[PDB]
Design a protein around this ligand. Sequence first.
Ligand SMILES: C/C=C(/C)C(=O)O[C@H]1C(C)=C2[C@H]([C@@H]1OC(=O)CCCCCCC)[C@@](C)(OC(C)=O)C[C@H](OC(=O)CCC)[C@@]1(O)[C@H]2OC(=O)[C@@]1(C)O
Ligand code: NA
Length: 994
Amino acid sequence: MEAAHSKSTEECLAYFGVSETTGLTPDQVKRHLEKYGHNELPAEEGKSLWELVIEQFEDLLVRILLLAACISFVLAWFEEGEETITAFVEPFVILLILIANAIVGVWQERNAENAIEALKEYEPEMGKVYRADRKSVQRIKARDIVPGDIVEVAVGDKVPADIRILSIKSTTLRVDQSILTGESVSVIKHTEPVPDPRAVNQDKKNMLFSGTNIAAGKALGIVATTGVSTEIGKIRDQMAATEQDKTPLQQKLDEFGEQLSKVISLICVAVWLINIGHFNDPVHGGSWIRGAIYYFKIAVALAVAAIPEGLPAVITTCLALGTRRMAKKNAIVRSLPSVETLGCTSVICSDKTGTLTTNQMSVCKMFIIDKVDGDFCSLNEFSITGSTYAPEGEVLKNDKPIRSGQFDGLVELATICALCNDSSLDFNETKGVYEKVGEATETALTTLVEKMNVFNTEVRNLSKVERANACNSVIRQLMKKEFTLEFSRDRKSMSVYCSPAKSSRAAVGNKMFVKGAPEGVIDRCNYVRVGTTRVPMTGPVKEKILSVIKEWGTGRDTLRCLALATRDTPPKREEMVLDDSSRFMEYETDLTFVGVVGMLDPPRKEVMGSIQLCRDAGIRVIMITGDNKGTAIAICRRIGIFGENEEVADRAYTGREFDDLPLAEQREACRRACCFARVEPSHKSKIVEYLQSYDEITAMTGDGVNDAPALKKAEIGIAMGSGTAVAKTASEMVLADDNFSTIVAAVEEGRAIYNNMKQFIRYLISSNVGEVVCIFLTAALGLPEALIPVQLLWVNLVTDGLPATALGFNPPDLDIMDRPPRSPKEPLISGWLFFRYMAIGGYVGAATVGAAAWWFMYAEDGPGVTYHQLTHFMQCTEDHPHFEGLDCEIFEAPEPMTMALSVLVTIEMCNALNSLSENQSLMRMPPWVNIWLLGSICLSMSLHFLILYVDPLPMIFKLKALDLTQWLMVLKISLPVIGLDEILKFIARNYLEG
Ligand SMILES: C/C=C(/C)C(=O)O[C@H]1C(C)=C2[C@H]([C@@H]1OC(=O)CCCCCCC)[C@@](C)(OC(C)=O)C[C@H](OC(=O)CCC)[C@@]1(O)[C@H]2OC(=O)[C@@]1(C)O
Ligand code: NA
């Protein structure tokens, strides 16, 4: 039964055909188990180790590298020679990267925990049932529990399934439904049916939800639903059905792989098309076995030259360090790729209480009735100082200190606040401050009566701990609390039944003290306290009361108002049913209005400016609160969301108003709203969807399992540090200090990181562009290989990895938050920038190839080989007289490759400096603006010389130490790359900035 809350206890027992006294028969247990299944959320997909390794080879680029590893392995096999010490090195390194890449991918899934499995933390192992096969209670496995089962719970027990309460054996039953919401304040349950079939869980006062705890009491019930059909199971299904898209960077990177694959293939065809002329070569002569190895050697090199092998490592490093940085700013980011998404945040939906505000309640104002004389009326307004829970403050009338005891109305006022209260104070000796015990709202009343002191009790003589509950205890000794009628949202109030102390043999003198929302309470007030006297409630007076309430709540005070009334003649104790909470409003009628208290939940000191930062950054901020629409709007105006005098009729909605709109007007409302009050449980997810329908990168806050699907759906789900474990696991970021300002600080940091990420991404890919051209040129012209896979890998992983990493430490722009959010579809390289790297790559490709060609020709250490024979170097071993001179093995010399490599390295060191700013020249933004970058370049070169001198290394990379003259030639051809980019930057700054 999904609607068991609306059904009577007799109807639920009738439905399943079960006896409350005996329970389900063994046949019924069988039939119900087979029908509804076991009481458990389905097990997650057990991704095996082998299946996990395979996923690491599903990426397009790692498959290309895998293919390039195979050809390299085959070529390292089928070869003539005895020097295999530098043959199987190349295919082994490529394989090592793939394996190392596969190791990391497995290490992540090993440590990653999804929120769906975090929900299984809330399903207990055991559960107690009554079945017909036994007299006493039998504790069985909770998964074996079925709908229709008669279950028993007690204090400490974790509720095994969604249960319709049948009988409460103890006096009262308190349940901790904190895993659903955030308020750990235990709620009271009953057995009477809840009329509304479409009632929310908060109002289902006769249900026990799977996962919650019995704070107090012991009761018997019948299982309504199990497994995924429970409230927590229905949430699990929503999360499982929620499909989270990849971050914009991941979508661009994936796009990059798709296109890099095409290019790689295209080039291969191009190389073949250029060498079509080999079809006109005689079949007799030459070597088709050496001609094939050449075309396969350059193929392997082409792949390695294309893939930014070091990029996924550099990205991860930047994010991990940024995460550590954000952690110090109270922002705990859980997913590394979410850092980018965080910087693209266009809309931030934050809860008010605890985040936008301090959740530190404090009574600021209050008023009683001073005089009612016909059409004439006067109130007595007061003000209270001190915003802390400490009993340190005074009461003022017109800014003048007054004694509360001199007002009879205020004595009754304080009496209500002390007795109609389930909270208290406690001075912490460890911290040294007064902390709250219970609800923040009720505790604010506890603090108030300590400041008022209507009886002028000697409180300056007491200690610090005894000072906490002083004036309260004085009032408690006056009236004896018989019982309390709990709060309920249907009547929005609570009350306490009290009898006088000195009254052992009497039945006359009882009083009821009511508190709650002003509207409902005042409507039930037929009388008015004027000091000790009482007058009938009249029109003009009632309006005078409601007006001030409207002013305090909707004004710049933004106060939450509570109405306090007393029932002078409460119904007889015997004529009251304390189990039927439906009759409570009736019990709280014919009241006498005493006064109204106004309390403030002050906004954080940093929220005001943080909101403004968002306005500057084009980030819309939406408030979600429990306040009424009027107060909600007022608080928005106070914190700067709304202009103090701007129209907001179409920018603020209640949950009910939002439901009354058609689906078309709902989507429209979300694109312009900034304030949601009294929101219904399903609305957070709905709002996110609508925001996503406008392609908004949405941030969303929450702290309970109720908000879990919304947190998972939003691009950046945000959880509170004081929040639940499931909410945290369902989020992308955790606010350690629960502060809204932490969010904004995180977004700014998110922008700074991605800007630097744009740099080393474009820097590394730019290098790969130049490398490919080098491989293409050396294949098109038919030149000996200038750069080999082993060398290119060292560059892309180490030599260029260090400057790339350093580019992630580039100083952020000063106008970071003075710019609109970045469009997710904004490409990393396009337009004139595409042309720049198109030119730079062409330069690098020519410089590296040219440097190798320079050694074969116009070099002293090199031969006098002409161009015509350098392109036909594969024919020197056969057609000797055509190229008579030196040995044919000189075409495999290590010197020209070192010249190419050193040029590649040097240029990329220069291009790293060119990557400090996109358009700003080095004359405007010097290289020493980034000290980390300069240090990285020094290290990269030190590692370059490392593999040039340390004997085991230059053999592996096929390198030889360059002469001073040769090194000069490297600088002659490398350094002017700065001038080239400088010109291109100059063209961008003066002929494109429109
Ligand atoms: C490693 C070497 C090059 C070949 C390369 O990256 O491939 C291209 C390709 C994949 C794109 C291009 C490259 O285009 C070429 O260089 C083609 C010329 C071929 C010359 C050879 C002679 C026959 C990028 C690299 O060119 C330069 C000019 O910047 C820019 C950009 O890249 C980005 O925006 C960064 C990716 C996150 C992408 O156009 C990108 O694909 C698109 O989806 C984007 C948006 O990605
Ligand atoms: Na999410």
